[PDB]
Amino acid sequence: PLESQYQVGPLLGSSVYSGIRVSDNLPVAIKHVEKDRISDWGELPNGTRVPMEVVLLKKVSSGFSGVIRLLDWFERPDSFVLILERPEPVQDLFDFITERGALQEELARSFFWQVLEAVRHCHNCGVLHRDIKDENILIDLNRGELKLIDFGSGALLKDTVYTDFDGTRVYSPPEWIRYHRYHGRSAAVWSLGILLYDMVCGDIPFEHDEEIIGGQVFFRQRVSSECQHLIRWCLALRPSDRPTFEEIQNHPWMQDVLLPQETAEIHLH
């Protein structure tokens, strides 16, 4: 019972539909994925061959966190359908930055901190997202909580080298651009530096390969010296020179973060 358990509404993007669970009127998002277009396949704790996205979502689904929750899924002849919990009201972080421009550092701090906690949660669950970007972050405008979405480019986390990548190139690290190789955590930290710059400057720093490998970060907005330092550290050209997640969260710019509800009341309501 798939069409009987959810009322399907309008297209949110692409193929993802707004919907409501009939059992309790819970807002959901209904994501359809064509079998023919699936890159990596995995097996569930049952041996059922499913899209890796499903595997990764079940591994991070445990509990409450800043990660989108997979509520259910179904297999169809030519597709899989994914049922995700949908915040309401919501805006994704790309549209938010487009409308607001560069974010006040207090707000960027709260947002960036929540993305850090969410990505730590992924890594604790054995999952590498591989496509951190403002487009893949939802803001619950009433609760002030961020949610990481779209694990369609993710992978199981491992300590050895990755040689495949299907995320967003302008958030990919120079070792991928130059050598088509990267390690998971240090590549994640690079994308987080791109995201932090995006937040405090109003757009990402690099559009072209030469910029990505060039190692120069120009600040187009007024940005505090502490924040600039964190960004430049996350964007170190050598992966081993980048900070760990713990070093990011202990950085002086990251202290005295607002709680989510404070964030909503001060900046979103």
Partner: peptide, 8 residues
Amino acid sequence: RKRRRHPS
């Protein structure tokens, strides 16, 4: 310059 989304 123009701000734009980037595909995966």
